[PDB]
Amino acid sequence: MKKVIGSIEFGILSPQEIRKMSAVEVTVPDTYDDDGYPIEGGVMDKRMGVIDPGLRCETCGGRAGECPGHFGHIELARPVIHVGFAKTIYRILESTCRECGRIKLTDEEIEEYMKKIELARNRRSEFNEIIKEIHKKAKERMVCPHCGAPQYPIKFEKPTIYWEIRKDEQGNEYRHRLMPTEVRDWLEKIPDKDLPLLGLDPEKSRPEWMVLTVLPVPPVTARPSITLETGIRAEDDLTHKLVDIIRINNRLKQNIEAGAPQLIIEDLWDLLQYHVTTYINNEAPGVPPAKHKSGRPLKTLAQRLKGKEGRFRGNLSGKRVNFSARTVISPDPMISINEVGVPVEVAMELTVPEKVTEFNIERLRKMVLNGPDKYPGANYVIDPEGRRRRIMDSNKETLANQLDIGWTVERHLMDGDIVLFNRQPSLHRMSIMAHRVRVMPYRTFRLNLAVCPPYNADFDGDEMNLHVPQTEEAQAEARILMEVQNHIISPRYGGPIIGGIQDHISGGYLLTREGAYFTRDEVEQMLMFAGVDITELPEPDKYDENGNPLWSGKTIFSLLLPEDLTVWYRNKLCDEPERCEALEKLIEEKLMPDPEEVRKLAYDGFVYIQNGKLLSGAIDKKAYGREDGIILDLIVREYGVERARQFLDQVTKLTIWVITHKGFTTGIDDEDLPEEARDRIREIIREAEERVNKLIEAYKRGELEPLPGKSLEDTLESLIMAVLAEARDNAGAVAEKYLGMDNHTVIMAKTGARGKILNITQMAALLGQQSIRGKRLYRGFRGRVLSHFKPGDLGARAKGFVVNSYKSGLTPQEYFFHAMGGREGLVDTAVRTAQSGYMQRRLINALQDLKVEYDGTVRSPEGIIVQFKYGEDGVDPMKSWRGKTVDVDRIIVRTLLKMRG
Template identity: 60%
Template sequence: MIFGIRKRIKAIKFAFLSPNEVRAMSATKIITADTYDDDGFPIEMGLMDPRLGVVEPGLRCKTCGRKVDECPGHFGHIDLAMPVIHVGYVKEMKRLLKSTCRQCGRLLHKPIEIPDAEGLEDVTEAPPEAAAGEGDDEMAIPVFREDERDTAQVRVCPHCGADQVKITLDKPTSFREGGHKLTPKEVRERLERIPEEDLRPLGINPDVVRPEWMVLTALPVPPVTVRPSITLESGDRSEDDLTHKLVDVLRINQRLRENRDAGAPQLIVEDLWELLQYHVTTYFDNQTSGIPPARHRSGRPLKTLAQRLKGKEGRFRSNLSGKRVNFSARTVISPDPLLSINEVGIPMEVAMELTIPIRVTPYNTEVVKGMVLRGPKNYPGVNYVIRPDGRRIKVTDKNAQNLSETLETGFIVERHLVDQDIVLFNRQPSLHRMSIMAHEVKVMPQKTFRLNLSVCPPYNADFDGDEMNLHALQSEEARAEAKILMRVQEHILSPRFGGPVIGAIHDHITGSFMLTHRDQRFDRDEALFLLSFIGTERDLPRPAGKDQSGKPFWTGKQIASTVIPRDLSIEYKASVCAGCEVCAREKCDEETGYDAYTVIENGVLKCGVIDEKGIGAFKGKILDKIVRDRGPDEGRVFIDNITKLSIGTIMLRGFTTGISDEDIPPEARRQIDDVLQKARQDVEDRVEAFNQGLLQQMPGRSVEETLEVEVMKVLGRARDQAGNLAGKYLGLENSAVIMAKSGARGSMLNLSQMAGCIGQQAVRGERIHRGYEGRTLPHFRRRDLGADASGFVSSSYKSGLRPTEFFFHCMGGREGLVDTAVRTSRSGYMQRRLINALEDLKVTYDGSVRNTSGTIIQFAYGEDGIDPSRSVRGEAVDVDDIIRDVLGVEVLEDEEKAGFRYGEYEADMTSTQDEFETEDEGGDEDFGGD
């Protein structure tokens, strides 16, 4: 038993409306297809009959006497001249027709084979208590899928001996028996003949359903509230699609009746009957396959009953599973590095539109009165006042004075958003719990939402035109809950991989690299300028030394240390680490000049740089440690400070990159060309060997495949060599290299493709072979298997591509785009299905996973009961870290042996690089904006 649930749904019963029920619930019979008369009044017994409900304000319903919004509307009905088949039930009808006799209507089984109530238990393995303990209504009703197949074989009725003819469904709504077409009337007669006792085995409860009701003789007409007409500015009436469709039905119904009664030729009557069937069918579902959709005069297909419910825009998905909300705002986002990660900048316009209800108490009466007095147009004011009797009064400049005076304890006042209010901030697609986080309001000028750059990764936001939504919370509980559970700082560690998702990105990393790399020196003014970025008051540390001219200087490491918590100690290899054979550890700086071994002792950066591995989103180890050991408050402060410091540094020193960063000396260019020429020759040789049949086949591969593999290997190596040659001339004095090595943006591969050689283009993981007969482009000879003819691009992005290369590059690029498009749509659908399946599961206080009915799904969440966002890269405890903390000894971390370290986790997940992939991040950048 779950507490709080008083009523449970025990069963849901589905039944058909009988024609009598349709007529009984009908407020009026509808006979004319006309809606309004010349004076604009609804016609009696027309589709807009006033007895069907009220839509116009001020009028009263003729059926129930209530006003608009009080009267729910009332059904009417149309008596059909001839019976018509209901599209929704054709499958069911086919099943029934097939398994019953065409003459006597009995189930096509020998009498003994028809299981009676006692026999059922055996056949269906129904649990004994289900049949014994409960009444007939709840008895498990078996549906005989197998029997259907059996009966299809029966040729002669075992009851009356009538020959059976095979019945086929002629989609969408007609049945055919042998060659003869069954009219709806005949179908109805047959269904009428099925005796009640044969219905139960067919899965139908005869107490509530008669099968012949599937053939319509009376059509319910929905109330006008369901299909309101709209009055355009021009004064014209525009009717709802459903009304249009019902008009069609009525018109044809009328003509059919007249023709039939006048004894018109069979053919004409049948045509009209068919037409009526078409209209009724499209009235239910206008996308029935096999018939053309009914269209509006403009050519737009009508939205009929099924279309109102189905699909993403249907009632279920867009009005029941999801709803539009009040107290929300949406606008473009832009960055503000000086905001805290917890904050969000809100335009004044938004702050004055969104409100928060405040209850007037003796303690706040004066303040609230002041706000009401300012009215809705002076910030921070009040838009509405709600009196204790529930009346809402809009505050205007005129009544502000008055309202302010009448304000008393117990009133509720809807005041403007002010700084520090808690709001929810969201960016679609909401794939994460981090896609909706709680922020503190900071009201600002200008018209965009402003957010700290460090929170871009969890939202996956950028500023190329992205828009985000904001929701003002309306209750104290909601605000408290949001503040505790949803605040940005509570989501620094991701439940996805137990590391930080919020951290430094791009320029933050470059800046922090520039601040901490090797021996950066800053004079007094510079040091103070940097520290001024961190709002809080703190003393300038003691200068590190004096330069030649005797002026004191401070080191970047010293300044960076000011924001590192006092007693933090950590040691790791930074992103810039070149992965030397033997690590020089603390002496990395002297020996290699990379300064890649980072040591922080008691909050002092002893050596090494702080780069992506230290503070980056996804990878930052310092960040990880601070948040894990000291909690989100300190984590937030650290992120705010270190990023501000980095921004300060990058502003102070200046940083730029351009295509000249990829300049390499002509000497290097020559070397690269040599390498590429050699590789090309190498490929030629192999192709030659292949043509002469001298190529040594690789195990498990054909000769052709062997050639491909080898050529790919040669060209891949050539690209790498070219990259290395280019890289030799691109040192850490180069801005682009700084970004690549520190992990701020781009990779060395990107650089080598710009400076050196782009490399092999691939389509479907192979060199390019498609195109003309025997060749890829007319520029090549047939059967040319050489490097250039199969998509090897030896140019660099900087030098520009030759036409053939450009073409191949486009082929590869297009595949990348298509792949990402396909991936996103597929993963979106998978996400939807997963969410639908898992939405009601929760972890209870005892650690077990249960659904809403209390059924246990898992006895301990994740089998180990560990919250992944509190875990260390998925592990419950970080033994190395504990040893270090307790003993003060660093456990040597052998990256290779350790295998999976979460620093590489992101790379593992996103990397689609194989040896000759060209774009390292696929469709990562799309500059098209949203």
């Protein structure tokens, strides 16, 4: 029975409409009287509404909240020019004629412009181009075609001033200052037939209305008054401006009636026009902004709408919301990836309204009986009539008994409820997801660690927001569309995003590395800890001394895999390609080689899984990592989201147990290189410095050959930088060579768990060359960065090359150079964030509302067909195989192995 706004037609207002709309004429320039009691006819007249408690308005009455607010009006003594339509007024005046008010266009030109303007009038740009062409053709004319009168040129000034050069004696063309009255007379005589040629309709935009005669007064609610500490009742700046207008035009009316010299009348007219200009737009160019008592410009209507904190954006686009909470986040790997740990205190405050039905009457009755202080309780109860009651210890039993079908209970949060979890800034879609609730005692949100990469969150003080949907449709949408397990595959590149991080990968490597073996107790304990519902241990693999069974890590891992899974690939740990080549030959010869042969030719570097048995390989980042988790991707594509969730929840816990009970540490001796490596590194650095010095000497003698680089100095700098980069790379190569895989830091770097080789070579060999904006350090004194070097020195050390390492300590000059290097990265991030944010805002506003229709096409809001088939293929990038439309090889291999097996 309700209606909805189907369309809005914007138009300009009219003085008659202003008169009819308003309910009072504000003539008294006073705001408030003693003890309130607003002055009748004042800027706070009760006719326009009531804001304070205890009083009623007259047009509609009711409380302050009940009154919607009503419009007033002020009848100006003499017309003034609206600021927003100033340029349009100027164009109209300099295009149309003065006598007949008709456009300075010929009849046939009018006819052809009529024909083209209707043709394809939908597009705005071509419409404006036609308008500009018509304006130019009208302006170029001198004598009006309809009447032989000289259309004198008209000039415009930024603060809405028009003073055309009226004909003077001897054709001097004196610049007569136009007044709004004669401009109004000019505009009224304009006919309506040619109005469309001026870009104006004849119904909601009349050129006469473009000049003000009576302006409205916003309702009192629209201009609220806030009481200060001493009851100042400081009103909105709009009220102060309105008071100024009322006083000024009152005095203007007085001196108009008195018939004073017209110069004072003109001065008051200018003052009133300036005041109205500030009221419409306080920042309008060409006028001095009207500051308040403390020298602050008033925020008039124009500034109220615009801006980040303005009305249009930041007030309807976004706003503060109810049923939300915010607190810090702490890790918890013992919950499922689609659950969030909620403090018990938040659950007592946030509530979910539940309707009492037949199947939940018992639970709701019990929870109402629990009251608002025990945890599984409620706060408010809503009867079928509509009135809302509050639960208290006095009326717990009575309210519990009165509960029946149709009532509503505002219960506490419970396990299994659905909530929204968000982290700011919200860069992509996955920044908001839906997790199930699990209540916890302490005061921080608990988030599973595999879910960090989507939120891009770290437990170093980050805070996150939680939202609780209240309506059933919202809950269903959150449960079906935004469940965590539904977003395992990223829509940006078609690969997994919710995968293992750090300890998961490292513990996987430790578990499935070659030579790892586990006893009976360890196997049983880790299997129970992971949650696998095993009942009998498999047959022992190797018997050690004293006759104790031992199980390889591969068997324990394979217990977690599906029964029918076959895949093989090369991971990051590969270093001997010959072993992988031999294994590939064995697999390719016949697609099901005998398992014993594969165990014979096993090698960490070629992961191979045969019917759920891990035959050869070590867990790496390529297994279930954040970026290229092949096994996780295969499971989530071939079995389902539930199976992927179970697999992740098992492997994370198993790897955590392995890394916790096997021991994993890093220390000061993780960078203790032997003597030979140090001697080699010193030799490399000395050779590089000698080469740089030779280049510098060659440049000084002038024998340097200019590279295609324009400047000889730039060629020298490029050569020096290339030499230094090569030196650092060679030092890194030797440092990496001399550190084995028994080192824990090397394990963490190679598997991709944390860091890279650059960190190792910078902590063990040397930092290298420091630079800003791609150039060596040059800012400082004349010809030298620091006063400790001779001027004109271009050597390696003198410009930033640091030959020391973090372990060996830095000399003070190297320390200063390194600080100069790091400051650039800091400021780079600081500026990059803002630039990227602005770009994303522009892109979002550009492409916000495109969608896929039911026929497969993508259409613009008006109806234009952007694409005849989305993505040229019709396949969602999220469901694509890493950007491919379909993985043919995988399907062929899977089917062939399935049937032939």
